[PDB]
Each structure stands twice: as structure tokens, then as C-alpha cells.
Symmetry: C3
Subunit: 298 residues, 3 copies
């Protein structure tokens, strides 16, 4: 796109603030930002807020979201679709023009780990170019294993294709499949979908801890066979709904846009790979690392 040549808009922080016991304001941008998806490989991504996947959003079950999208893209309109919400797509997920802002309101009445993404036609084009992310809706009454969990992180899986190539998006194998982590608390890593960061800078944990991961496979195209090497998932909640409760899974099958809450215990010090067991995708980037130390540091 001619109007994107040379464009690299610095990331803009997510803005959220609660405005009522059950109402939250959220302000995001659509912007064009260069991301290093593999060593030496820059992708001029279409993003929310300069991250791909976009920034993490967390709300409570029953919150109504008052969402504003500010479109910084000079020529391409964009929109927002939250899987968490009940809304009219043709009224509430509509396009925002270049250099304009739009505000939309809708309720998040279901707990879980939901994909969000741009909903502008062709949707495949907007997602593949990077306009995806996760919103977590915390269950009012928690998860029955809440009191067993020592530490938690968010992981997202996505693919990257040949740059803005709709033929490749529809008919080709992914060039890269990647994990990224999004921060839940101060001190947590916050990364983009790439082949290397979570290998060189693993997530940290302590020997003996039970770890919870909030995970989603945003695609656009592949399903995911999610597995942590050296453990078994004690408990799994499909899409993060506390009722969808499985136990003792080695691997969790996730649809495109599929989410889960998974919990597992790390019993020994060492480095534990995290992968999608579809190992062609793991070979093309989709391996993260969890470093388990005696203290949780290092």
C-alpha cells in the first residue's frame, strides 16, 4: 500500500478506566507498526496499539464495555470485534475511517478467554496482517481450583504469512507460527508474536508451583495442539468457562479463535518447552520456554 510505505507508528498504550461498578471504558488505536517477527524479518503489521497480537484487556463478568477505536491508519478503515460481547455486528462492529474515532457499547456477560480482532472485510486480510488479540472476562465466582494456583500468565498463538498477500493468506502454509505473552500484573513480560523472544527470555516459575495459563489460538487459519513438555494439565477449562472442566489432559485441542484456562504443576528445576504439537508449526516458531528455578528468579 503506497500510503503505508515508510510508515511506522510508535506503539500507543492501551487506555482503560472503570466508570461504574459494571461499566469500563476502553480506548484502542488501529495503527501501522513494524514488528520483528523472526530474526532479521520485519513485518509492517496492521495492529491494535502497535502490538501484534494487540494489548491484553481484562474485565469482570457482567461489565459493559464502552469501546473507542481511534483509527491512525492513513487509508485503510478498521473495526473491532470482541468475542466476549453480545452485540449487533452490523451496528456495533462497524468500520472506523482513517483519522476518525468511533465509540461502541456492549456487555461482557460470559466468563472466559476470548479472541478479539478487526472485523473489516476481508476479515482474513485484517487478522493475518496482525489485528488480533485476547480479552479475558474474569468469572464472578472464580474457578474451583483458584486456591491451588501459584502463578499465572497469558499466552497467544498466531500465524504470519507473506506480506499482505491474499493468495498466500487463503491458499498457502504459514511462514511462521508464534507465541506471545501479555502482562497480567506489573513485572510480567509483554511481547509480540515472534519466533524467538520467549525462547531467549523464558517465563519464570518456582519448583513445585502450579501454573495457570490463559491461552488463545487466534489463527487466522490453523488449529492448535497445545502442550507443555514435562507435565500434564491437571485441570482445563475450555474457553475459560468454569463449567467446561476437563482433567489430566496431555494436550488441549484449540480451534481457530479457541481459548482455554489450563493448570499444571512443575515438579523439578529446569527449562520446560511450551509448544503446539503440530510440529511443523512448532518448527516454524511456535515454541516458548518456561524456566523453573528453586527461587523463581533468574
Amino acid at each position: 500500500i503506497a500510503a503505508h510505505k515508510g510508515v511506522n507508528q510508535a506503539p500507543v498504550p492501551l487506555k482503560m478506566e472503570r466508570v461504574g461498578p459494571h461499566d469500563v471504558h476502553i480506548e484502542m488505536t488501529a495503527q501501522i507498526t513494524d514488528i520483528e517477527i523472526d530474526k532479521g524479518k520485519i513485518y509492517k503489521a496492521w495492529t491494535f496499539n502497535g502490538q501484534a497480537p494487540g494489548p491484553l484487556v481484562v474485565v469482570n463478568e457482567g461489565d459493559t464495555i464502552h469501546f473507542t477505536l481511534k483509527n491512525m491508519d492513513p487509508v485503510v478503515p478498521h473495526s473491532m470485534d470482541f468475542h466476549a460481547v453480545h452485540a449487533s455486528p452490523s451496528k456495533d462492529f462497524i468500520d472506523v475511517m482513517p483519522n476518525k474515532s468511533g465509540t461502541f457499547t456492549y456487555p461482557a456477560n460470559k466468563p472466559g478467554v476470548f479472541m478479539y480482532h478487526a472485523g473489516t472485510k476481508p476479515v482474513l486480510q485484517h487478522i493475518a496482517n496482525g489485528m488480533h488479540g485476547v480479552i479475558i472476562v474474569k468469572p464472578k465466582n472464580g474457578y474451583p481450583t483458584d486456591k491451588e494456583v501459584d502463578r499465572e500468565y497469558v499466552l497467544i498463538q498466531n500465524e504470519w504469512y507473506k506480506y499482505n498477500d491474499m493468495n498466500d493468506f487463503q491458499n498457502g502454509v504459514p511462514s511462521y507460527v508464534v507465541f506471545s505473552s501479555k502482562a497480567l500484573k506489573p513485572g510480567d513480560p509483554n511481547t509480540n508474536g515472534d519466533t524467538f523472544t520467549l525462547k531467549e527470555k523464558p517465563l519464570l516459575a518456582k519448583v513445585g508451583e502450579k501454573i495457570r495459563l490463559y491461552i488463545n489460538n487466534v489463527g487466522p487459519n490453523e488449529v492448535s495442539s497445545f502442550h507443555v513438555v514435562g507435565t500434564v494439565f491437571d485441570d482445563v477449562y475450555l474457553d475459560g468457562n468454569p463449567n467446561n472442566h476437563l482433567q489430566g489432559m496431555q494436550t488441549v485441542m484449540l480451534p481457530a479463535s479457541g481459548g482455554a484456562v489450563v493448570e499444571f504443576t512443575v515438579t523439578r528445576p529446569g527449562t520446560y518447552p511450551i509448544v503446539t504439537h503440530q510440529f511443523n508449526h512448532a518448527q516454524k516458531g511456535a515454541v516458548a520456554m518456561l524456566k523453573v528455578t528453586e527461587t523463581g528468579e533468574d
Copy 2:
């Protein structure tokens, strides 16, 4: 196939009649019928009764099916496999020769949403050319959410490939992935697997209604990440068995031949897309529409 050149057998209505409290007769054809799978693109499909996917069959849990296949194909034998039934495949799912009829009897003792398809070797060839469909077996004691449902439809997902090309069937990406709807009651739409009909003529519903969809992904080759934009599935019964009960799913992962009953509420007027979240497949046709109005009409 030389004997199929110029052949276009007009669709023949499904014949069903109950013959006992737990016995039902079913008569279908195998026939060669031109179907417009994309605008300007005719596929000379191998079909049951001139539809692809074939006509909807509904029986009750515990019904024994007395099934007759009349093979109108001038040269290719065909057969029928109902996933709903217990049967001997080598005795009951056997080939019917051109211009011949065969009758087979077997019980449907499990509730749910089952694929049916031709079982003639090579099975891939018969399914890919269009010989697939759904049979629903209604649970004797219903679903626990039966009294919450306001309206219901059937949706089927299938792929189309290069015409009768076994290399493409085995090794290539689908040319099209499509939704079709099959009528449950008088007035319901009844369509074929194509890229456009359910976009131009959406399914209809009323603001505030809870909708049930009986769905199956007949393939032949892909899995499906089934999602309705702007809602969350309140309740999901995997393969339509009332015991396989999930709640609050954003997206339902379906194997090839996999079925489900899904229920969701539409809270606002508008047009709600229905897709497989594997968006390369959605881009190649697999998007339907649900139009929600104040009255349910229009």
C-alpha cells in the same frame, strides 16, 4: 466421465413415511446434477436427490430405518452410510449398481446430528463430488434447554475441489468452503453448498430470541471452527448427544463428520455473520448470515 457429459438430472424429492411406532421408510436417489457452487461456476455434482449436501433426514431415537437407494447414475455405482445407525458395513452399506435399487435396514439408537455419505471406494471421491448430508435423530427425552429455544435451523459445512480431480482431493487446498441450510419445517430455507445464497438470503430471527442450530461439518477433509459473530454459545451438545454438554463457548471445534447442537441469544437488531473461524476457509465461501429484525420478518 464420458457417460456424464451433458447429464443434469432434475432433483427428485426425498420420500419418507412412518410404517410403525419405531420404523420409518426412506427412499433416496443417487443422481448427477449441476449445482452452482460459486457465481458462474457449475459443478456437475454426484448427489443424493439432486442436492449437495443431500436432503435432510429426521427420525426419532429408536427408529429402525428401511432405506432404499435408487441409483440413477448411468455408470458409477453408489452406496449409503448413515453415521446414525449400527450396521454391518460389508452387508448393509454396499454398492447399488447403475439403474438398480437396493434396500437396507438398520436401527438409529443414538440421539444427535450425524453425517451421512456414500461409502463406495474410493470414498473420498464420492464425498468430494457431493455425496454427503445430515441425518438428525431426535432424543427421546429432548435436551434440557428445549424450553428456552425460540427458533431452530440446520447448517452444514462442506468443501468443493477441482472437478473430479483425485490428486486435488488428496493433496490440494479446497477451492471453496461453503455453508448450506436444510429445512426443518415448512417455510424454512433449503439450499445447496455454495458461497453466496445464505449471504444474499440470510436466515431470519427476532430480537431477543434464543436460536438453536443443528450443525455438521461433512468435510471431506477440513475441520471446522464454528462461530456466530456477536454472540456466545449459551449451550453446546457435542454430536447432539444431550450428555455432551458445554456452556459459554465462543467457538465449537468440529472434526470432519463432526456434529453439534448449539444455542445462542441474539440481543440486538442487525445482521450476524456465521463462520468457520479458519478464515482462509471463510474467505473462500464459508460465511452465512442471520438477519435479526424486530418482528422476525424481512
Copy 3:
């Protein structure tokens, strides 16, 4: 690999012996063995013990495994990863050098049907070349349907690609997808992943029996849509954990490395195909047969 030219190491039997009420010794080899994966097609596979998939391992819930790998490969190091166990991957799943042995100890504290595989980088290369298998961990308190089961078998699904071709492994469609069976009791078939053996020499059962299959899809890359023609799965335990209990499924979706225990009744004499319903994979080998006779013999 030059040092593999002409190499064909005869299969070596698995060695297992119990050494305590909750401790078991296991000794396996890594070796290079020619396997006929399709008629006239030899694959010089990287294997455990000269089989691909490797030999079946069965232990009890709560057993600690004292595992020894003897690496017979003249030049390539190999390692072992059991999905059943809790372990430190960077200490316990480490490489064993050519002509060396390594011993590792870890507990199997979860019931189910688990993949095992070599964990040497690049892992895709070792799995695709044949270093995969299944370990079953029997539940301390069994399955609630144990008393209904008349007969049981193990089936594994895997793919084969162009010989040791990392480009094909990552980016290409499988050349073959295959089933194999591993013996649970004296007299059971024990076969390798190929396109023909379980067609020409089907598994045997008796009319009216309820059959249990322990199944795993080891990949490396594809998911599986597991289906037995002519029946419906009465009961399914995902990953073989008794808590993950589904009923009345036509087809069971399995991730790469995904496992299940499935149970179904065969009501009539005949030959029942077993397939992955992703029929491009079935067409390329992934069809087995179950022959049901009045006596269970023949």
C-alpha cells in the same frame, strides 16, 4: 546421512520388568531400521526398538519409570520424552550420544493414553522420521464401563513424508497417513505404521461384543477425526482420563499427540472400516479393518 547408508538394524525387543510395587524398569533402543510403509516403499526409519511407531509400554497409575535408552544410531543423538510423566525436560529428556546409554527416572501419576517421542532438536525431524509411540497408564480405579468391555486393542495414527526432507516435513502434505496396532496381550497383532497390514490382516472380534480401543494420533503434523464405520462410540474418555467422559459420539477429534479411550458395540457380522474422517488422509493410507465373525475367529 552417509553413516546410515546400507544400515538396517534388526528390531530389538522391549525390555520391561517391575522392581517395586510402584517402580518399573524400561529399556529401549534408538536404532535405524527399514520399514515397508506402503507396498514397494521402504523408509529407513529412525525408531525406538526397530518399530515405527515404537513398542507399546503399559504401566500403572503411580508407577515411577526407570528408563534406559541405548542409542544404536552411529551418528545422530536421540532422547526420550514420555507425555505420561512429570519431569524436568532439560535434565530428564536429554540427548544420548551414539553408542552410549542414558538412564532417567520420573513418575507416571496420571491415567491415560500418552504419546512418547524423541525430544532432540529439531524434534519435528526425529518424530517425522519415526521416533514416536504410546505409553498407557492404567487408572488405579479403572473406567466406570470396565465391566461392559469384551475385547480391547491399541491403534496409533501417524504420517510419513518424503525421506528425511525437512522442507517437506514443515511445508508439505503427508505422503502417507497410517494406522498401526500394538499388542496388549499374547496373540494380539503388533504392526508398524503402514497403508496395508490392518487391511489385509484385520483385527478380529465377535458379533455383539463391546470393543475398547486405546488410541493416539502421534502426528507429527495433522489432527485426526477418528471414526469406526457402522457404529457409534458408546463412551469416550478424552486422553484416557476417566473424568473426561463423553457419550454417543460418531467421531472423536484428536489433536496431534491427542489420545482417547473409545468403546463401541458391533451388532452384526461383517468387516468394519476404521478411519480418520479427514478423507484425504484416509485415501493416503489411514484405513484399518475390524472383522467381526460369529465366533471371533477367522
